[PDB]
Design an enzyme around this catalytic site. Structure first.
Site, short mmCIF file in Angstrom:
data_model
loop_
_atom_site.label_atom_id
_atom_site.label_comp_id
_atom_site.label_asym_id
_atom_site.label_seq_id
_atom_site.Cartn_x
_atom_site.Cartn_y
_atom_site.Cartn_z
N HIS A 39 0.83 -1.18 0.00
CA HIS A 39 0.00 0.00 0.00
C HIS A 39 0.87 1.24 0.00
CE1 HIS A 39 -3.30 -2.57 1.03
NE2 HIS A 39 -2.71 -2.96 2.15
N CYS A 89 -4.68 4.87 -2.04
CA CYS A 89 -3.57 3.97 -2.27
C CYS A 89 -3.51 3.74 -3.76
CB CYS A 89 -3.83 2.65 -1.55
SG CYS A 89 -2.74 1.29 -2.04
N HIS A 92 -4.30 0.19 -5.26
CA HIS A 92 -5.62 -0.31 -4.93
C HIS A 92 -6.74 0.72 -5.11
CE1 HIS A 92 -3.09 -3.25 -2.46
NE2 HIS A 92 -3.53 -3.90 -3.53
N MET A 97 -9.72 1.58 -2.65
CA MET A 97 -8.94 2.02 -1.50
C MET A 97 -8.72 3.53 -1.55
SD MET A 97 -5.82 0.05 0.24
CE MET A 97 -5.18 0.56 1.82
CU CU Z 1 -3.36 -0.53 -1.07
#
Ligand code: CU
Length: 105
Positions: A39, A89, A92, A97
């Protein structure tokens, strides 16, 4: 005050936990690598109250956190403008995210 946002839920979802947080100027947000890494934490250059790319860059952590237990933190400026700060992120983002911090008095 220092608040903690986990990267990846304990259930293993690609989310920030919590995904929305209200803070004051000068507070610190700790981003703790939790599950399903890697991340990172990128603040949007347009979706902050100043529409300032420089501000967003100063709050961000572009390097990937690779291992559970790693952390990075953002301490918001003492004069951080009030309003909403969207962050995400990068790997993601498309999976959802995305988070939001609101600075208030
Ligand atoms: Cu992530």
């Amino acid at each position: 005050e220092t608040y903690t946002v986990k990267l990846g839920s304990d259930k293993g979802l690609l989310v920030f936990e919590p995904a929305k947080l209200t803070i004051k100027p000068g507070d610190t947000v700790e981003f703790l690598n939790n599950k399903v890494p890697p991340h990172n934490v990128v603040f949007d250059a347009a979706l902050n109250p100043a529409k300032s790319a420089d501000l967003a860059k100063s709050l961000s952590h572009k390097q990937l956190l690779m291992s559970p237990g790693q952390s990075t933190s953002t301490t918001f400026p003492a004069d951080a403008p009030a309003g909403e700060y969207t962050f995400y992120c990068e790997p993601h983002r498309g999976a959802g995210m995305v988070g939001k911090i609101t600075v208030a008095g």
